[PDB]
């Protein structure tokens, strides 16, 4: 009965410690309710955005003031609200309990463990509303934040403290890219010191519970569950949770960032938050504007997405990176929220659906994507290996538009067309398969120098894969060198050339021919 003894001891310790005090406070009464809001009167002095308290246990916050009335929003259960209840002003502006035991769990947007796991510990409470770091506490951005995708880091690099946007059409594969990036850091976590360690967080808004369960299962199978946490606001919740979850996620991430640990915030969707805010504002009887949107909506986003930024060495040199996701319809970009969010951030990755329909699986557009930081966030070796293939691809597509019905061409034009086709066919990649830096550099070097120009375009990928495997089996010096010096040496290039030649001598796909 050791467990029984512990239970009895805990119960006795709690019950013998009961204590309460008789203190005065202001209490008001509800006058009307319905449709998710209620009006309360009788409170002399309450701060804006105060966390009220209701007799049934439900909670609420105060948004709109008046000469004799106070607006309110019911967060949780709503049917218990009726005329005659007594409210009680309590505490101050609401906050979130942040700590270090949140890892590997799922929590309510308000900070409650909706998971089947027992209760969590608490370290300190942080208010949601705090001023962002000033302009005199930031450095320049220079760091190779890997992503595990060949196209993304070849075309549009990502560094620490850089906000990158992903805007996509329905059923394109944004979440797959996000999950690959989120689980790419297993090897980084396995290292000892926290200089490579990154603590990542995930936020889910307006999604079915089964989808969240599937995502959790995928992450658990990937083995990255150990260094991540999830915040979930399914569709069954009221508008308050959908409106308030991202602030909680940002605050929890910011507490870690402020003490010198790198983090990575991810917002699943922002249109749902805007819709919830619009619904609340319309229900509170405020003047409307274009597209039935309140004027301040833009300001809202500026308050949220601007928290993440690189820090200086004086305060510990923390960092935070955001990856907001936007959904557009009918391949339209002139809509209100897309224009606002595009103008507020830097760097874009357009995800067309025509490309995803056939051929490329990543389906990333190349002629519109751009990164502002660019070379300042690249690795020297892969920057050298890049060889400015952007112009090559551009003139390749421009010429192949012409050469579809053209059989007689300039020899150099044919060579350029073949090189572009080979590069495009190389750039594809399946899902759930992250790649480390060294193999990406090796593959890009193989592509650029023209070594595979003799390979028929129909079966290149498999061949490439085999080469990589063989290179990993019978050779290990080149990986060590590229890992230690982050530069490609001429002697390593000669050895790699010899390996490529000897391997290509003995590979066939269909009536193949090994050539010089």
């Amino acid at each position: 009965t050791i467990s029984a003894a512990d239970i009895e001891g805990a119960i006795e310790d709690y019950v013998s410690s009961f204590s309460a005090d008789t203190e005065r406070e202001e209490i008001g009464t509800v006058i009307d309710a319905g449709d998710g809001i209620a009006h309360v009167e009788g409170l002399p002095s309450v701060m804006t955005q105060e966390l009220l308290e209701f007799p049934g246990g439900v909670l609420g916050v105060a948004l709109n003031l008046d000469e004799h009335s106070v607006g309110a929003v019911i967060l949780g259960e709503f049917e218990k609200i009726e005329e005659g209840q007594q409210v009680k002003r309590t505490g101050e502006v609401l906050s979130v309990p942040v700590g270090d035991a949140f890892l590997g769990r799922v929590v309510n947007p308000l900070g409650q463990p909706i998971d089947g796991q027992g209760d969590i510990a608490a370290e300190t409470r942080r208010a949601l509303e705090l001023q962002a770091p000033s302009v005199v506490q930031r450095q320049s951005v220079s760091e190779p934040l890997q992503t595990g995708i060949k196209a993304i880091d070849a075309m549009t690099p990502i560094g620490r403290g850089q906000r990158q946007l992903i805007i996509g059409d329905r059923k394109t594969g944004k979440t797959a890219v996000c999950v690959d990036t989120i689980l790419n850091q297993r090897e980084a976590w396995l290292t000892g010191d926290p200089k490579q360690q990154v603590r990542c967080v995930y936020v889910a808004i307006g999604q079915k519970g089964t989808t969240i369960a599937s995502v959790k299962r995928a992450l658990e199978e990937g083995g990255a569950m150990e260094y991540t946490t999830i915040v979930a606001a399914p569709a069954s919740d009221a508008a308050g949770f959908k409106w308030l979850a991202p602030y909680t996620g940002s605050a929890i991430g910011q507490h870690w960032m402020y003490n010198g640990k790198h983090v990575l915030i991810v917002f699943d969707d922002l249109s749902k938050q805007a819709d919830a805010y619009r619904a609340i504002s319309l229900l509170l009887r405020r003047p409307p504007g274009r597209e039935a949107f309140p004027g301040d909506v833009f300001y809202l986003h500026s308050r949220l997405l601007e928290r993440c930024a690189k820090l200086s060495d004086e305060l510990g040199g923390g960092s935070m990176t955001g990856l907001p996701i936007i959904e557009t319809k009918a391949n339209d970009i002139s809509a209100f929220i897309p224009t606002n969010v595009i103008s507020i951030t830097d760097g874009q990755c357009f995800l067309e659906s025509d490309l995803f329909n056939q051929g490329v699986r990543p389906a990333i557009n190349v002629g519109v994507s751009v990164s502002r930081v660019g070379g300042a966030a690249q690795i020297k070796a892969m920057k050298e290996v890049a060889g400015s293939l952007r112009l090559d691809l551009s003139q390749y597509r421009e010429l192949e538009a012409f050469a579809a019905f053209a059989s007689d061409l300039d020899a150099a034009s044919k060579a350029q067309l073949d090189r572009g086709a080979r590069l495009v066919e190389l750039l594809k990649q399946p899902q759930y398969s992250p790649l480390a830096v060294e193999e990406q550099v090796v593959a890009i070097f193989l592509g650029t120098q023209g070594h595979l120009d003799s390979v028929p375009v129909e079966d290149v990928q498999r061949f490439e894969s085999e080469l990589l495997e063989h290179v990993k089996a019978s050779h290990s010096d080149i990986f060590d060198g590229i890992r230690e010096t982050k530069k490609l040496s001429e002697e390593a290039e000669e050895k790699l050339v010899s390996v490529i030649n000897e391997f290509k001598k003995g590979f066939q796909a269909s009536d193949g021919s090994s050539v010089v």
Binding site: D32, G36, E79, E82, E83, D115, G206, T210, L283, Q358
Partner: protein
């Protein structure tokens, strides 16, 4: 204690109560209406509090012939409907009164219509390969057992016929209980469905509930909740697999918009009521399969004027996993199923759980159709004689494939004399591989239209 009526307009009625007598939200109220020929009993459900002991609510019956000053009584309880095994083989309206027998089913236990969605801690994904006899659904977008399945398309494309064929094909091979709910449809369809079900023995195994459009908007907004209550009662205690079919979803959103226009709330974009997404999400969370219980639901969603930019279809798309939509261009072309493969998608179609041959065939056919759609305008304007050999071959293959996806079904017997035909999965896979290889190109145009099986194709070939 009782209150009075002070204002009346449209369907919404507001009433007044003395001190300490106001009821909580969602409480049934009864009102008496008298006349020489129009005598009924108005049933009202509380909507909101206006303060000053005034409560505004809506009605489930026409408000014609009501006079101010009539007392209104309260029952202090929510709407309820009898449940049990005896519900099987009967027809009910929204209120729960049995339409077939006026006095039947007034002694079983009763449950409140309003419930709570299941907790998040008991969710588990369901993966299973449920196969039907139709080629397009088998190949492009396989259905998932215990998951969401829904359709799309404008008016007059053929969704109801597809639903009838699907239920006819499945209910014959099911050991569980099915429940049918009709939100909005013509009375002729319901009567014909009842007669057709009576033509076989399956009627005793299923329960039907439906309301029509001529009724006031109050009734159209509550039938789905009652159907969900019955389905949940069948699932929770019996521990048995259940089937659920919903004719439409747009209707109750329309009713909500209509009532919210009069309730006093401001409108929103495209004249829709605010907080429609919240209500849709709250309702759609009920249909879910737990770890030990499985329920399969098939729904049909209407769209206005073939516009996917409308906020309602865009909102309701996110709640689905396996989807198949219909297009009007293919219907005007002539193909009867009228399913567009380019835009439809599934959520179990990957080589991780399915043989790689399926994936390869699907990718090849999708690429071919995409290329044909691209070359459409040049073919139309400059003509086939301008293209090269590869383009001509792909055009011919695309025509062959596009003709081959057609198939006759048994439900077409009333419209056309051709009898039904069904084909298994492996035969379709092999046939599609043969067609995409390009060894059937010698056949004429009409040989590939309305073909069930490969042997039927050969027989038609020998007939020309």
């Amino acid at each position: 204690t009782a209150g009075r009526v002070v204002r009346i307009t449209g369907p919404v009625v507001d009433v007044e109560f003395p001190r300490g007598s106001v009821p909580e939200l969602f409480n049934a109220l009864h009102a008496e209406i008298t006349f020489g020929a129009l005598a009924k009993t108005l049933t009202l459900e509380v909507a909101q509090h206006l303060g000053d002991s005034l409560v505004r609510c809506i009605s489930m019956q026409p408000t014609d012939g009501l006079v101010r000053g009539v007392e209104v009584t309260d029952t202090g309880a929510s709407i309820s409907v009898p449940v049990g095994d005896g519900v099987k083989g009967h027809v009910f309206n929204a209120l729960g009164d049995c339409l077939d027998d006026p006095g039947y089913g007034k002694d079983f236990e009763h449950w409140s219509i309003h419930r709570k969605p299941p907790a998040f801690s008991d969710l588990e994904p369901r993966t299973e390969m449920l196969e039907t006899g139709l080629k397009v659904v088998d190949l492009l977008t396989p259905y998932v057992r215990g998951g969401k399945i829904a359709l799309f398309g404008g008016a007059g494309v053929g969704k109801t016929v597809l639903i009838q064929e699907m239920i006819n094909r499945i209910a014959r091979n099911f050991g569980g209980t099915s429940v049918f709910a009709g939100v909005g449809e013509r009375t002729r369809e319901g009567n014909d469905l009842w007669v057709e079900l009576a033509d076989a023995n399956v009627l005793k195994d299923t329960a039907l509930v439906f309301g029509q459009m001529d009724e006031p908007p109050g009734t159209r907004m509550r039938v789905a909740l009652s159907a969900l209550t019955m389905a949940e009662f069948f699932r929770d205690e019996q521990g048995q697999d259940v089937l659920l079919f919903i004719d439409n979803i747009f209707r109750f959103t329309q009713a909500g918009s209509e009532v919210s226009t009069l309730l006093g709330r401001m409108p929103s974009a495209v004249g829709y009521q605010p907080t429609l997404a919240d209500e849709m999400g709250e309702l759609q969370e009920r249909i879910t399969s737990t770890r030990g219980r499985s329920i399969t639901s098939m729904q049909a969603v209407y769209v206005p004027a073939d516009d996917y930019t409308d906020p309602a279809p865009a909102t309701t798309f996110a709640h689905l996993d396996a989807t198949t939509e219909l297009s009007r261009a293919v219907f005007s072309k002539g193909i009867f199923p009228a399913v567009d493969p380019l835009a439809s998608s599934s959520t179990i179609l990957d080589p991780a759980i399915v043989g790689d041959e399926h994936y390869r065939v699907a990718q090849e056919v999708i690429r071919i159709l995409q290329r044909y759609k691209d070359l459409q305008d040049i073919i139309a304007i400059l003509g086939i004689d301008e293209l090269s050999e590869e383009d001509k071959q792909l055009v011919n293959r695309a025509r062959r494939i596009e003709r081959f996806l057609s198939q006759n079904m048994m439900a077409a017997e009333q419209f056309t004399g051709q009898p039904g035909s069904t084909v298994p999965l492996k035969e379709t896979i092999e046939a599609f591989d043969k067609l995409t290889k390009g060894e059937f190109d010698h056949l004429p145009e009409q040989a590939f239209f309305l073909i069930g099986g490969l042997d039927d194709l050969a027989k038609k070939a020998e007939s020309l």
